[PDB]
Structure formats: C-alpha cells, structure tokens
Write a protein that binds this ligand. Structure first.
Ligand SMILES: NC[C@H]1O[C@H](O[C@H]2[C@H](O)[C@@H](O[C@H]3O[C@H](CO)[C@@H](O)[C@H](N)[C@H]3O)[C@H](N)C[C@@H]2N)[C@H](O)[C@@H](O)[C@@H]1O
Ligand SMILES: [Mg+2]
Ligand SMILES: [Mg+2]
Length: 175
C-alpha cells in the first residue's frame, strides 16, 4: 500500500493548503476507473505552475527532495517512491498543461483511489501523452505495460474519440 498511502498524504497536505493537484499518468487511469489495475512505477502529479514552491514544501515536509529537473517539470523522491511532477498554467477558467487539449485539469474530483475522491487529469490529457511517446519510441517497440495502459485508456474514452484526438495531434505537429 505504500504508493496509495503516499498519494493520500500528499493530497491531504495539498488540501490543507487549498492547493489543487491532479493525479496524472498510470495512477490517473486507475483513479478514473476507480480500481487499482496494476503496479505503478511512480506517481505522476500535475500542479499549479505558479505555486510550485508549495508542492516542494509538501515534498520536503514528507521527508523527500527534488531529485531531477526536467524540460517539462521535475522528479522528486520520497523514501523509495518517485513523483513525476508537471506544471499546469491558469488559462482564465482552468489550469492547463502546456500544449494539451483543453480540459486537461478538470475542477471536480473525477477519480477515486482507495475510497478517496481525487482530482485527476482528463482521459484526453492522459492519452495525449502517449502520442508524444509514440514519436519517441515506435509503438511496436513499447514495453507491454504501456501498450496495455494505452489500450485501457482508449477503451474508456472510446475508439472514435481517440481516432479524432490522434488526428488532431498529428495535425498539430505536422511539418
Ligand atoms: N505537456 C507537454 C509535454 O508533454 C509530454 O511530457 C510528459 C512526460 O513525457 C511524462 O514523463 C514521461 O517521460 C519521462 C521522460 O522520459 C519519464 O521519466 C516519466 N516517468 C514518463 O512518465 C510526464 N509524466 C507527463 C508529461 N506531459 C512530452 O513528452 C513533452 O515533450 C511535452 O513537453
Ligand atoms: Mg508514471
Ligand atoms: Mg511517470
């Protein structure tokens, strides 16, 4: 239960600060489904970019530290667990992940992890990131756990919507 216990600790500390945080990536899939479906390599979080200091304070207060600074965000470690953190920026009516489809950070808690309601990135935002991944690593070459998580997200959003979103991504990044 270590990752779930950590997620609950991180979100309790964020709630106390009125700091919204969105579960992303694998755990966001499981949160929207309301079921734990696999072992997760890390915990992905999306945070208000202008409030980054408050997230780092939560990390430090849990005994962790910022471990690596990335082009898109940062990685922090709390004990043996990894947090993969990406900023979202206020766009008049909601926070949005840069370059992602609108609605990437919904206001309402739309997922559940071990009985706790949680904010989590939208299905479109989740799936969008696999498109980047497919440009970096041929899907035929993906580790099976990513093929399976992608297919689960696609089943949940629906093939029609996914085909449309993929086409939008291709048009966005077409030469
Ligand atoms: N919004 C724009 C950004 O969107 C994607 O970035 C995503 C990262 O790729 C994810 O991180 C993954 O990749 C890391 C580096 O390989 C791994 O350490 C990590 N465990 C993986 O989950 C992270 N969780 C979400 C983030 N949206 C693109 O790729 C990036 O170019 C683009 O600027
Ligand atoms: Mg992850
Ligand atoms: Mg990750």
């Amino acid at each position: 239960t270590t990752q779930v216990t950590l997620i609950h600790k991180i979100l309790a500390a964020a709630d106390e600060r009125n700091l919204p945080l969105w579960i992303g990536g694998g755990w966001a899939i499981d949160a929207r489904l309301g079921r734990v479906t696999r072992k997760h390599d890390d915990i992905d979080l999306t945070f208000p970019g202008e409030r980054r200091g408050e997230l780092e304070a939560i990390v430090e207060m849990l005994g962790g530290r910022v471990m690596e600074e990335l082009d898109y965000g940062f990685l922090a470690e709390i004990g043996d667990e990894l947090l993969d953190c990406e900023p979202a920026w206020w766009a008049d009516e909601a926070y949005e992940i840069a370059e992602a489809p609108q609605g990437s950070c919904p206001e309402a808690a739309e997922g559940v992890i071990a009985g706790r309601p949680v904010r989590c990135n939208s299905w479109e935002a989740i799936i969008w990131d696999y498109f980047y991944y497919a440009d970096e690593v041929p899907p035929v070459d993906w580790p099976t756990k990513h093929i399976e998580s992608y297919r689960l997200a696609c089943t949940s959003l629906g093939a029609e919507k996914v085909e449309v979103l993929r086409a939008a991504f291709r048009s966005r990044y077409a030469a």
